[PDB]
Amino acid sequence: SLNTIDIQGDILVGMHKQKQLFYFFAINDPATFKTHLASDIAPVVASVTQLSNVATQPLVALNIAFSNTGLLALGVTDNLGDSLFANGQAKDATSFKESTSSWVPQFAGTGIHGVIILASDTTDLIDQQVASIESTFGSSISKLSSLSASIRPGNEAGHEMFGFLDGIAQPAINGFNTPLPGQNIVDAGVIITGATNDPITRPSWAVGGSFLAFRQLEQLVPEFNKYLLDNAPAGSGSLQARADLLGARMVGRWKSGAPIDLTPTADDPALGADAQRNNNFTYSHAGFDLGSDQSHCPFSAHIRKTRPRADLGGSLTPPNLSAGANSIMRSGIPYGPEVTSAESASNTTTQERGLAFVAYQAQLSQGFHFLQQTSADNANFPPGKTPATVGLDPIIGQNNGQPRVVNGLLPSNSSASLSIPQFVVSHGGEYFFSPPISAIGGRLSA
Ligand code: HEM
């Protein structure tokens, strides 16, 4: 059964701190690094168990993950059973129709050996912990780059940079989570390596870990806002209200979190806020043909692309349980400054902001990589639709820098196509393995 005492907390619970830092490092002098990995890091790595109880939530929550080259730097030559991980994300970039030539140079290679995730309610507390780490490891650890992140302020807390409530939908792990209405229920082995029904044999020390897919995804917020206003469908309501409808059609939820499948023409903030109701849908509606009806939610909507529910078969009434093996746990958090007055006024981005995207899964080919390549970037996914050309995911869909053709967004005519510029720009990332806690002071320090 699932030993959550040994699983790093960000995988199944999330850090849920106001501030987060992703500290990307290289390893020098591995013998020294190992001594301090065991003495300074292992004892303060936060587990799922620790983070699940308010009384044992640490002032500073810390998780750590290693790239393939990081594991090799530690002398670990075992096959973790994931080719995508082994090759690194840079080599996978072409799978998503982007080029590493546009990436942050540090990501465009395999020099990064790991990431330390620090999380606390102030940046000062994070900085203290970083200083402590640098002090004790000394030059055996080398900071290559970092990314600071934060829960957004005020009423936007929990929302991402475009303004949409985030973190609503996660797979429920059978035997661990108490499933919510509409929530998918999956074997632990979909997310945790070596757990129930993970078909891939793993090294013994790796049982209880997960692969971490990190993506630095810049969001062009003023451009997005202006696009919605310019293309707002006609109707009663303010221009902004109509623009909001278009945005909700693109995401699959209103900014409040209310799923459009359950409220297609108007927002419902109370619904959005209620975990017992805001996920209780399958995309099926009696009296409507699933293959052609986009009046409730477009086939191209972001959440419909990333969790198709009834589009891939299964129960038409909640909960739909299709494609469990293609589930990911998300622990993303926004980064960069809020949109400034001048940027909003000019409808133009000057400073970089976006999502520090984090997905956990036991198989990269089934999770993040599949959702990006086979769904989001695929004009003919989901399958079996009429028209067959769904178009691309308007939020994350990519086609080598070109505007994306996205169909079904306009309620007045499902055959109407929009050509949408990219609102999300990849600056690259890396694939890591978050080991079980026992491996940190154990195998990895040996
Ligand atoms: C800046 C980029 C992104 C933004 C702004 C964004 C935004 C959102 C929002 C607002 C939601 C709805 C809230 C929720 O259901 O929890 C969502 C859901 C989701 N997103 Fe994204 N996301 C981004 C990147 C990605 C990427 C790259 C992937 C995978 C390749 C992804 C996969 C998912 C999944 C699996 C869900 C939940 C779907 C469900 O269970 O119904 N997201 N995202």
Numbering used by the authors: 3 to 448
The authors write:
DyPs (dye-decolorizing peroxidases) (EC 1.11.1.19) represent a new family of haem peroxidases widespread in bacteria, archaea, fungi and other micro-organisms. In the present study, we expressed A. auricula-judae DyP in E. coli, solved the crystal structure of the recombinant enzyme and several site-directed variants, and used PELE (Protein Energy Landscape Exploration) to describe the binding of its typical substrate RB19. The DyP structure is formed by two domains, each of them including an antiparallel four-stranded large β-sheet and two or three helices resulting in a ferredoxin-like fold (plus two additional β-strands). In spite of the obvious similarity between the two domains, only the C-terminal domain harbours a haem cofactor.
Moreover, most of the variants show crystal structures largely superimposable with that of WT DyP, except for the mutated residues. Aromatic residues were changed to serine in the simple W377S, Y147S and Y337S variants (the latter with low refolding yield). The proof for Trp-377 being involved in the mixed protein radical was provided by the W377S variant. In the high-resolution narrow scan of its 9 GHz EPR spectrum (top), the tryptophanyl contribution observed for WT DyP completely disappeared (the spectrum of the W377S/Y147S variant, not shown, being nearly superimposable). As a main conclusion, Trp-377 appears responsible for the high-turnover catalytic site, since its substitution (W377S variant) completely prevented high-turnover oxidation of RB19 and DMP (and decreased over 40-fold the catalytic efficiency of high-turnover ABTS oxidation). In contrast, similar Tyr-337 and Tyr-147 variants (and the double Y147F/Y337F variant) only slightly affected substrate oxidation, and did not remove the high-turnover site.
